[PDB]
């Protein structure tokens, strides 16, 4: 469906103005007829974007109500009402058991539904942001007259007019223009104004001057044009549809959840029906056969687990909110940890998005300035008298000014009225020479010639601030070579000197080096005009050369670039040390893209492209073995004629990849290419041209300050302070939460065994029921909750940023090793500790373990109010039941006591508690509150009715203590083996 939109567009900028009118039945001068425009409206439809059909929240909520655990809990809830129905008909049961348990279980499903619904959130308003880029109104020429109309009423063929400050209402063929410049950052991510004129200037319509696009704005001048595309058919309207239309897809974390749901659901249905038939064979009435099944359901399903996961995710997202990293989708909290490839935009993401002075060439020496936002570098020069001469030209031969009321904000961050290069120079001098306004007050400008297309230079004449002179100084800047052809002397370390071929060659060298760094280079020179030839009232003519512009003194060079953000180089290296592949994907030109790649460490030192090898060896590129080149730089124009299989080979064959001059669909294609190889991919960006890629990414991260509204709609995560170091933190947090989820899951599952085994022995042994159904829910929904959550606050056991990204095909959240430990080893020890306390309670009340076998028949018989114990005493029905429920209560408390040790062992997968310590305060809180809850549930009056919880005698609490301790020792010995031999036996069997 969207495969059409993933392709490069076709256009009609090649046609003549006249020819273009024939195609759209239009007038170049009079414009369309009121009737013809209305006709075309009904024909083509409105100049608007329609949002894609969404899934209502209704269906979204209910889709969770049927996912494995909820299905089993539904079967339980209904099976409760089943047994209740069968009762209400047969023998009038005045009880509330099956009825209430059926109500409780149905509530558990609904509430669990809210948790998973909260986790599976999708806040997407892509198409809405795009719609915000179409103006409310447009100016059209109809019947030879200009009028403002609803922009939706704009059709292909009419004559539209735009001027500085307004949004392009539709894709236009420029037919007339006067000084028109446009901001195409929507399509390129670059905000430098692009001229628009009627002349065709490139085969590529996205590069030609005679096309203006919807989603962009006119920055200055005026233009008229013929509408060629409207609504969804515009270049960026298609990007809108592509972006808004892209299928979301399941996250890595989501896939893991479903996976263990299958496992646990599997064992649940297995043991469920495996013992349902095992009971009927033993001659159990279907009346009972279902009651046992309900218990089996409740025992096997970890009722509180899915909600635990959600809370652990939420708590991890809260910590990241506190580092200026907003998470829109709870699952995106983990994806960053599983990320193996980052596709990053350059401008406004890796870079500050601001022309900044990078180097200066004066005194036959290359000086480097500090490009960082917060200025974390050092000085270059202050002493040289040459510097002050260059500094003066940079301030004086400059027409840029700071906007009013910025004195509060830092120099480099403040808004400037002017072109990017003049702003850069302004901020450079203001920083290291103080107030520039001061320099422009001490040296009043009397005449100037602003930068001309033809002159290729800008000159200014000022009254020298010096009192002993107060004469006229000439300054000029422009193209380095043009400035050179106008110089005779060079200000070396203070004093001038003739411009010999020697210094002239050093100039060329300096010029070539700076240009090689992808930096824009300017020349600077001045000339102190002779006093006798220029009186204090001498008039200077700016129109006609009234003053010399030759034999001037060359002062120096200055170079500039849109520099990396301070934290970016280090963040890139850190991603790469964690084994994450970092690719650059930018709408910017290749020379600039490549230079920043080396600056931030995308391309490491020494690595070459095929073009680099060819130039170094002075040989044809076809003569170069492409396998000798680990780095590559792909232009979008070449990308366009490559198949995906060939794109896949590029991705496979290079470690250091730069995709430059890419369109928005091309970014999507590169992302998909990476994913196709089985990689989890993150995208980082800030422009509307990142929207499709951000949507398709497993996780999209947008910049918060510099980011466009669209990009932040398309993302899963926002960096609110533009701190790229947050990606590094995000991946670290993502890995940590993945491990801690394992700990929390194992902990929760472990207590399933002591809830399952009592029901089994109840059938096979014919003893009184050791633990009840209600009692199970008091564990999974009550006591285990805070402890399970607390594992989310566990510190790393080792340097997680030192390991490679997990293999999502092999490294699962829940594997066989977890089940073996939780179900086969620790849970089994917990089961016994439960049974022990059960036998203790009964034996101390007169029913010794031996006489318990095959007694349930008489025990449950409501009409036998005289059962004989081991000592020959006789018990009524309600009397023995009180002891039985007291058994449920102590078995319950036994679970809590054995979960103490389990909580401590689940703390660490490898390390010892004596190494990791007990610095998790939430965990300790869990221990205290868990025990408080259990005690309250046993001793609070009335709980014997609502939950069948009975007061325990002090000695009862200590039954499971020896089992709780064996767990601690056992797991500590086991992990001691793991560490002592990384070999594999204990490791490959039990290492979560």
């Amino acid at each position: 469906l969207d495969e059409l939109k993933k392709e490069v567009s076709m256009d009609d900028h090649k046609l003549s103005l006249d020819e273009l009118h024939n195609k759209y039945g239009t007038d170049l001068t009079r414009g369309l007829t009121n009737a013809r425009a209305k006709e075309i409206l009904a024909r083509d439809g409105p100049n608007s974007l329609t949002p894609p059909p969404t899934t209502p929240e209704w269906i979204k909520f209910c889709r969770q109500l049927f996912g494995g655990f909820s299905i089993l809990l539904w079967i339980g809830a209904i099976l409760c009402f089943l047994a209740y129905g069968i009762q209400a008909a047969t023998e009038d049961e005045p009880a509330n058991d099956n009825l209430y348990l059926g109500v409780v279980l149905s509530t558990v499903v609904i509430v669990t539904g809210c948790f998973s619904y909260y986790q599976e959130a999708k806040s997407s308003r892509i198409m809405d942001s795009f719609k915000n880029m179409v103006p409310q109104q447009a100016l059209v020429i109809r019947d030879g007259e200009k009028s403002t109309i609803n922009a939706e009423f704009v059709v292909a063929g009419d004559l539209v007019e735009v001027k500085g400050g307004d949004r392009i209402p539709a894709d236009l063929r420029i037919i007339s223009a006067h000084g028109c410049k446009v901001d195409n950052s929507s399509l390129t991510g670059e905000s430098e104004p692009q001229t628009r004129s009627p002349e065709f200037s490139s085969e590529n319509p996205l590069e030609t001057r005679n096309i203006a696009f919807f989603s962009t704005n006119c920055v200055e001048g005026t233009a008229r044009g013929v509408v060629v595309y409207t609504g969804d058919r515009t270049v960026m309207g298609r990007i809108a549809t592509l972006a808004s239309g892209l299928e979301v897809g399941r996250t890595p974390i989501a896939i893991e959840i479903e996976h263990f749901i299958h496992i646990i659901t599997g064992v649940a249905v297995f043991l469920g029906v495996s013992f349902f038939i095992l009971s009927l064979i033993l001659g159990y009435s279907w009346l009972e056969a279902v009651i046992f099944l309900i218990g089996i359901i409740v025992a096997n399903v970890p009722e509180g687990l899915l909600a635990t996961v959600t809370v652990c995710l939420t708590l991890t997202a809260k910590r990241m909110a506190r580092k200026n990293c907003l998470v829109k989708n709870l699952e995106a909290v983990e994806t960053l940890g599983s990320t193996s490839t980052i596709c990053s935009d350059k401008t406004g993401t890796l870079t500050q998005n601001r022309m900044t002075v990078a180097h200066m060439w004066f005194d036959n020496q290359i000086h480097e300035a500090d490009t960082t936002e917060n200025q974390s570098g050092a000085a270059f020069d202050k002493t040289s008298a040459t510097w002050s001469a260059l500094s003066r030209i940079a301030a004086l031969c400059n027409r840029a000014v700071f906007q009013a009321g910025q004195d509060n904000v830092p120099i480099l961050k403040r808004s400037v009225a002017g072109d990017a290069s003049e702003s850069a120079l302004l901020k450079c001098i203001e920083l290291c020479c103080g107030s520039v306004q001061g320099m422009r007050d001490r040296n009043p400008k009397i005449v100037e010639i602003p930068f001309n297309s033809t002159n290729k230079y800008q000159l200014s004449i000022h009254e020298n601030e010096k009192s002993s002179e107060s004469r006229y100084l000439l300054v000029m800047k422009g193209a380095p070579e043009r400035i050179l052809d106008r110089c005779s002397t060079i200000l070396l370390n203070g004093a001038e000197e003739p411009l010999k071929e020697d210094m002239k060659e050093a100039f060329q060298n300096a010029y070539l080096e700076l240009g090689g760094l992808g930096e824009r280079v300017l020349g600077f020179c001045h000339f102190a005009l002779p006093e006798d030839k220029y009186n204090e009232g001498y008039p200077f003519d700016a129109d006609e050369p009234n003053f010399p512009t030759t034999d001037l003194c060359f002062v120096g060079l200055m170079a500039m670039i849109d520099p990396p953000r301070a934290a970016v180089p280090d963040a890139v290296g850190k991603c790469r040390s964690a084994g994450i592949k970092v690719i650059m994907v930018t709408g910017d030109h290749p020379i600039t893209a490549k230079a920043i790649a080396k600056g931030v460490g995308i391309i490491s030192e020494g690595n070459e492209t095929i073009e680099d090898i060819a130039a170094r060896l002075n040989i044809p590129i076809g003569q170069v073995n492409p396998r000798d080149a680990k780095a590559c730089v792909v232009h979008g124009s070449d990308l366009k004629d490559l198949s995906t299989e060939v794109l896949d080979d590029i991705l496979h064959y290079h470690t250091e990849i730069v995709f430059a001059r890419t369109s928005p669909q091309q970014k999507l294609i590169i992302v998909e290419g990476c994913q196709r190889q089985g990689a989890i991919v993150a995208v980082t960006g800030d422009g509307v041209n990142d929207s499709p890629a951000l949507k398709k990414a497993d996780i999209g991260v947008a910049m918060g300050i510099s980011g466009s509204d669209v990009s932040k709609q398309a993302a899963d995560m926002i960096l609110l302070d533009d701190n790229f170091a947050s990606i590094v933190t995000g991946v670290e947090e993502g890995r940590l939460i993945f491990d801690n989820l394992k700990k929390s899951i194992a902990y929760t599952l472990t207590s399933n065994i002591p809830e399952i085994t009592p029901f089994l022995v109840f059938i096979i042994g014919n003893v009184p029921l050791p633990l009840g159904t209600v009692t199970i829910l008091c564990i999974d929904l009550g006591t285990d909750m805070v402890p399970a959550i607390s594992l989310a606050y566990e510190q790393a056991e080792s340097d997680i940023m030192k390991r490679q990204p997990r293999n999502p095909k092999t490294d699962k959240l829940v594997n066989e090793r977890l089940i073996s430990m939780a179900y086969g080893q620790i849970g089994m020890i917990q089961a016994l500790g439960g049974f022990f306390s059960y036998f203790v309670i009964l034996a101390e009340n007169g029913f010794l373990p031996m006489d318990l076998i095959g007694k349930r028949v008489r025990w449950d018989d409501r009409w036998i109010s005289d059962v004989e114990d081991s000592f020959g005493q006789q018990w009524t029905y309600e009397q023995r039941k009180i002891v039985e429920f007291t058994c449920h209560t102590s078995f319950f408390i036994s679970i809590v006591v054995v979960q103490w040790a389990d909580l401590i062992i689940c703390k660490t997968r490898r390390n010892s508690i004596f190494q990791q310590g007990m610095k998790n305060k939430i965990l300790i809180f869990g221990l205290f509150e868990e025990t408080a809850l259990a005690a309250f549930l046993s001793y609070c009056p009335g709980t014997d009715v609502a939950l069948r919880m009975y007061p325990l005698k002090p000695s009862w609490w200590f039954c499971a203590f020896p089992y709780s301790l064996i767990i601690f020792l056992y797991d500590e010995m086991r992990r001691f083996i793991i560490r002592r031999s990384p070999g594999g036996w204990v490791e490959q069997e039990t290492y979560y």
Binding site: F925, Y939, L952
Partner: protein
């Protein structure tokens, strides 16, 4: 005692409940203290 051994079939479940609830409360307070060591 002999025929007056009524105490043999008696248990102070009332005190046990009072003590049990005291303990539960104090464990609840202790937990808050440790948690609130930083929020």
């Amino acid at each position: 005692e002999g025929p007056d051994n009524d105490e043999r079939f008696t248990y102070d479940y009332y005190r046990l409940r009072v003590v049990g609830l005291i303990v539960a409360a104090v464990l609840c307070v202790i937990g808050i203290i440790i948690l609130l060591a930083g929020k």
